[PDB]
Ligand binder design. Structure first.
Ligand SMILES: [Zn+2]
Ligand SMILES: [Zn+2]
Ligand SMILES: [Zn+2]
Ligand SMILES: [Zn+2]
Lengths: 209, 208, 209, 208
């Protein structure tokens, strides 16, 4: 039965042939330089390929995907992506997308040791501690969704606790957005993700350099 | 507004998926079973699922600046642990690309703030291969250092007990590619190491 | 003659001579194996050498020192020290020691960009944002002290959001302590670092493996 | 017991310091001017200020498991930036030591949880030098890998623009030591590199 790696390289050649036949200017024009307007921070989960689920093309979405779309404030991996997207490509939108049935969110609600995943998941366990009574009042499936939403909202806070982001929000109206992707339906939903404007004033004072 | 345009295109895409693959999304909701972990660049021109002609559920994905594997990076570390031990992917692919902004940054000497520590592995390869890279044009050096970065990434990937375990226990394979953003073609890298190399790595890294 | 490095190697040999003369069994007995009962997490600040300011000897204090004694939850540097000290050496005490006139705490209350220090100092700026009204109500010098104390208390919280620490606290009565070192007087003062008992219960539920 | 005993000994030490160095604490109350950055092991037997016969204010200090320099580690990165750029230390010392638990862990094949990613650089040196280390006794291998770790750390330390700038601008020096926990003596390591090596590093790492 088929080697999925070999099958993928053959499907890549078919995709390159389709590009050459249907849109022969697209890839050569993108090779001159990318100009995406969107930074996507989402989960590595194979069911959440940003460009496919958004109905977009190569060149549209600058992408970071990690376990459970977690923003550790001092993580160089997300830190370097955000610096490059915001300062160098000047994206207009930063999207943090969580998803239903997230294995990283579910791991954080369990109490099994998962080796190197344990430090990675600490931010999710911090949210679990802070919201423990609320999460215990929900079904397992509702708790995984609620913690996924709380994680997206906390990530948007962490994202704005960066001078490069606050500068872009003041200079060009950079927007930040929280989404949940429903792996069962294919639909994205927006999170309210409200903060008092008081919140951003304190953050500006505390973080702009 | 590209954000509101993308949400409208998402709804259209999800509706079309329900009509043209009616079993896909409901079966994916039960559980993912991807056979491939892709480690690639965040570059907007390298969306793994589209360039491979695949579907949602096929590729477990990590994308960062210049597809760099720092040995002790928890972000790539956690992805590799989850993909290899929990999802049991059969393939790990590191994919570099032509016209990589991270590779180009590393060949320059401009300070880029938080990017500077991130790009150290590329500058280590630049130092190690300095005569070879200086013998090339800037455009040729950006390709060459992209290739050297993929090959070094495959070494870093295999200096992990979780990977070495899966290679011996269940035949996990690792692969290096370069994506040409101008042609849409993936090229396989030779990425040769003597078998002697994996023996010393097993001794040095595999834990009980 | 002015070279502090060569002067330090000469003073090292004088110190080795003093050990051989005054306590000839000490270093050979320590060479058999270390048994410190204290893990110290302090600032790199040259004024805070733990073994000297505690009046202790080599072998007494397992030590981590970093900029402003910051505990990033997912930092492998502090993570590995804590794992080794708590699980393998079985220390009885973990001390987080902040200090007066901390340059890292002062940096976090300023708005100058300090390159690679910026991500490192984010937890201090998070405390600044959370306590902004309180810190703005104080003099510059009082704010530097207050933020230094808030940083030690936040570090003790981060330290207990680790299964290895919670396990040792329950199984063998490991204790954790917050101190401030006054660089001008040489005195250590203890911080209260009391938590509502609800807090510790939720942390056990949320973090113990 | 030992915690309350240490607080009482602290007060006695501060009282004795006021009598035997009456200018020291009042000068330190206002600031610090150490000329040395020490990067050493957390090992309780390697307290830098004590083994150097120095005082508070003399040694800006970073201690971690096995004195490992991960190139992109923000913990060591932030210390080096602060010491070199802001305090303008004249010397950076990396000190390894005999009977190092982290070095010994890297030569074993037991899984140690969060220590495993931390110890990768030691296992990379073990792989690179495997034949040489297998030719030695356990005790000789622990010393040899400790020395290889100090030398690799000095390379990582100099692959930083802040260090290279200080070396060129103000003659910052870097030094590798091994501390013998049994004798109390520091030994200097030869730590030779072709001058060719530092030139390629300057080209590859110094920001304009
Ligand atoms: Zn997920
Ligand atoms: Zn790239
Ligand atoms: Zn300090
Ligand atoms: Zn050691």
């Amino acid at each position: 039965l088929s080697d999925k790696f070999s099958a993928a390289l053959a499907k890549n050649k078919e995709w390159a042939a389709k590009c050459s036949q249907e849109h022969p200017e697209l890839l050569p024009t993108l090779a001159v330089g990318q100009h995406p307007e969107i930074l996507w921070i989402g989960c590595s989960d194979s069911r959440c390929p940003e460009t496919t689920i958004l109905g977009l093309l190569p060149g549209d979405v600058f992408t970071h995907r990690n376990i459970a779309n977690v923003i550790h404030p001092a993580d160089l991996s997300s830190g370097a992506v955000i610096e490059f997207a915001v300062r160098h490509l000047r994206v207009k939108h930063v999207v943090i997308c969580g998803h239903t049935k997230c294995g990283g969110v579910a791991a954080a609600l369990g109490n099994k040791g998962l080796g190197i995943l344990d430090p990675w998941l600490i931010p999710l366990r911090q949210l679990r501690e802070q919201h423990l009574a609320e999460l215990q009042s929900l079904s397992r499936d509702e708790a995984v969704v609620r913690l996924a939403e709380l994680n997206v909202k906390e990530g948007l806070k962490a994202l704005t606790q960066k001078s490069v982001v606050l500068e872009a929000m003041q200079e060009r109206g950079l927007q930040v957005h929280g989404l949940i992707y429903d792996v069962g339906s294919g639909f994205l939903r927006q999170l309210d993700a409200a903060e008092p404007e008081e919140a951003l004033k304190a953050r500006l004072t505390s973080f702009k350099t």
